[model samples]
Target: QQAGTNTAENHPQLQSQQCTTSGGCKPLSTKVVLDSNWRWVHSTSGYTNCYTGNEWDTSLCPDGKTCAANCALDGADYSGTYGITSTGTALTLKFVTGSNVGSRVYLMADDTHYQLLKLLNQEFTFDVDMSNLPCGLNGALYLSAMDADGGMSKYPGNKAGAKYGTGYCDSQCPKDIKFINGEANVGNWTETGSNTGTGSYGTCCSEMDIWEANNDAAAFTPHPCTTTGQTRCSGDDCARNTGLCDGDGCDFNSFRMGDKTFLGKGMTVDTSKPFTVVTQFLTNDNTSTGTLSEIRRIYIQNGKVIQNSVANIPGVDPVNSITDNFCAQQKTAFGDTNWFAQKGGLKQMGEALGNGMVLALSIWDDHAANMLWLDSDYPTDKDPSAPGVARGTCATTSGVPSDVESQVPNSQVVFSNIKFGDIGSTFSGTS
Candidate 1:
């Protein structure tokens, strides 16, 4: 995890706003850093790639520690290399940049630290344009329980630290990350695709998916975990069923809940144009110290306020927001095993938010599920008419990474106007 001297790391400056009941919104200095996995890793003394394609240099990366010490992460050429651009207020990410298919980035508080957000009893609002994003791709903005310093203080070998976007973890327990816990993830590395692979290790933590969308579909989900912050796992601990993290979170997708007309191109809260999204975290006592009880989704389009669509599925109570009761009923209606509740559910999610989580933005195509879980009938074996199985109108064959990357190379997503504050303070949506 050494720093590459060849290219100087220069974070792209992006401005956000913070508001309060007492003080109106004020500009906050911010920047964005590319994830370490996407960075160029080379030998410290030379330009020889320490990791290339989906494999590590066996000689340099004979072991995790040795590889960390021998390799350095190079800086990014944001626009030219990665197809990422940041204006003073907006950040856009292209789906394909030459050989690079997609990207993930973290918001930075400064040059060396991640911008941690505590959203308990708060509201987060942002403007997004997913017009160019199609059914197969996901333009996601989420929060994860990662370290502010990117594990630099805890993992001595992570010299690159947050400056290099070194630490990342989520509810999926992803094993595709090339580095975890400040060391190279070389052991048992096996290529999963032309540009993807999985290591023996996986990283796990709580995740709050505020937005996962395209012009054709959208969803907001909360994935809780038994563990908090960035935790490394191996063996069965990384398995989807046996892992400490919850792989199948309680998701609230309008179409999945039997409200297909609520989202999509030319639909209510139309995705064919830009719109404002607001998510509120409500607590029992209506205070920051109280237990989180509900998560509400609101949309503002064409200066009009729109509440979330209610679940219209049979056996599930009609509800618009996500709460413990809603989740329980939805799980039963969907015939899901209730893994979300087993992993601590919304309560654990609130705890993670109270502890502070890092903001992550990315655009990616699914490799395993073909993104069917997001925009098509998932568990393809299941009947399409089954409750919660039909998530969107996308074809089950859609979203193959190879197909999407090649066919829609120019697909992109724009996220801007990030604002955070107490409930109802971030934006005013007229009904």
Candidate 2:
């Protein structure tokens, strides 16, 4: 059936299995179902060794203890783990709040080289159970791209010794491309110095994006500098002439659904229940000149699409729009609530559809910036500014605050039935 023909009359017969759309698509067909045969990889190693060929023997980070050496914030003790369930039908990721109050825990799929071809023609779908996650835990299931080796100490910091459990993509100027559930954006990759002695070229590194998902009415607000939207750009902030993140005029992009902001009622996300979310893409054709449809993010709960929105990026593709001034390249001039930043921001995302991206799931906190703590319900932890409602008084084990003690425990999220392929593959029963 033509994608444009999707309607109630055309809706596939009801069944235990179903799918909702963010954009134009066809009925679910088993023939189009695709599985990459994913494997689990931890942000920290040593709990389990990595395996290949769809194996699930990767080690689960030990309970209560940090997984690897130096796996904490400012050298504090913290622990998180990643592994496959005994049934081998699900992936379990959990993190325990450690002595480090303002850091995160992470895990990624082994395959960072997801093909862009199929992705351009496909929709990525997954079922995640946030119900197991205790409040005060902030997390997301997203897809992204970055220089595999370009991180905190990887470029100018110390690429040779950028340890897995330790290093990060510092404000020191590393490249990144992100499509986050909370907030989204695009930018060029430019680095300040060359640790590899490969000759420093400021224009070489990808742009940086910092998305902070506050579990409140504001949701995932993105700023160039860091997790919080408050940082200002300094001369040392960029590789060339003071990079964009800290620039006074730095740009920001966003994703919205209907008239509702994130975490609102009628959305698929609920800390109280398990929900399925579907992200779909539609293209006029596969050629470079082909016009891709606006990316659509749909939130589904039980059996219906309660929320859906198209990122609105308007106008014909022009020279600047395609080259230098592309939405992805907008740093100094990208405006707040600009055209591309609207609900249907397609041009920049359309180009990114060709860049190979990987699907990943991770959980972390915003203690350093105190972002999520500013919101409510998402992370039911401390409210530093408040009088005594879960504030952090714990400088050490004996002095730890009651709220911090209650918050720093195992909050797990389970992901299953992750499928990526042509539209409708997320659902079944279509012949």
Candidate 3:
């Protein structure tokens, strides 16, 4: 959907751990590795092994905790398994949906990063209930896999055309529609009763989107449409009805990529309103270029982090505007009534690691009484005490930009978390 492959679908860069020196991707032999306690426990209902292409076989389990069969994920007959000689723990996703409504996989370098695994056609809603997952950040990268071997070549994360799970559009969107850039416009179902009527509609690319028949319980996304704005998944035109998630806060965390990736749930403002908007964590890769292997989720509140202003980014959300914020309509402000106004100052995204992974930031607002800003760091040059050293702002004369401060953007930011990697201390802050 992006102009090029700067996307998670094109995500999931692969690396080798214990390569088969002689056979390459073709392992010399397959082994069955599983702890006697490592068993498949059905979720009250049955479970489907997507890769196995088979239904639940209670026989595979003698008791609720035992494998009925002696099959191993890496057995000679097994389809596939990863993390053989990799770093970190394993994040296994066994698709367990009957109709494949919300079944998908996500990968992360650690918390605060993620991406979603995609399919050739939009089938079944790609949902990740991270509200209770383990991590310090939110959202998935919709990742992919690079099969140094031919194993993953047949799956979504491995190849561009590879398909996974049940072949159903991510939502109840009729089986006849197509998903591009994560959005879909189609008919909705008619069984349930609701004013919105019933038709097949979808917001692909956006995760956990539902084919809504009614307007109830509309908040918990990973939806086709995010309260933030439309997604490339909305495709061109088509009402641009892309859905992503807003609200519904969840847990979050940060981690260095080794084997496992942690996902986040939103923070509950246990303290002073949890800041207007909260940033989650640090990742090992640079998503700016979109080649990032590390994935992270950033959850915004309609009531927090009001958009101080807009830039080249399109499809602005009114709830985010410092304009609509605390206002019924657009109007001027009194004073100290605005979020940033009341708490005017620089805010930090990543946490300050006592270890080394530290990130510092200070923004130079347009200084508008009421306006939202996404990238809010700026510079100043001045020396209140130095003789005739008066510059426009401190960033100029305070030796900040004078070959001193210019290195870290002066009064703006200097992120030690810039190079996120494995160290003794993880992090105790948010992105």
Best of the candidates, lDDT: 1
Model 3 lDDT tens row, 268-358: 3111111112122222342222221111222223333221121111132223211222221211211112221121101110110111110
Q: Per-residue lDDT tens digits of candidate 2, residues 93-169?
A: 45443332222222222221122222555666666666554334545444333333213322332211111222222
User: Model 2: runs farther than 4 Å from truth?
Assistant: 1-87, 97-118, 134-136, 147-271, 284-293, 305-345, 372-408, 428-431
Candidate 1 regions with alpha-carbon error over 4 angstroms: 429-431
Number of colliding residue pairs in each model = 0, 25, 79
lDDT of each: 0.92, 0.31, 0.19
Model 3 whole-model lDDT (C-alpha atoms): 0.19
Give residue 217's error in model 3 in angstroms. 18
lDDT pick, better of 1 and 3: 1
lDDT of 1 by residue, 282-367 (tens): 99999998888999999999888989999999888899999988898999999887888988888988999999999999999988
Report RMSD (Å) for each prediction in the order shown: 1.0, 15.5, 22.9
Give the best candidate by TM-score.
1
- Which is superior by lDDT, 2 or 3? 2
Worst 10 residues of 3 by lDDT: 210-219
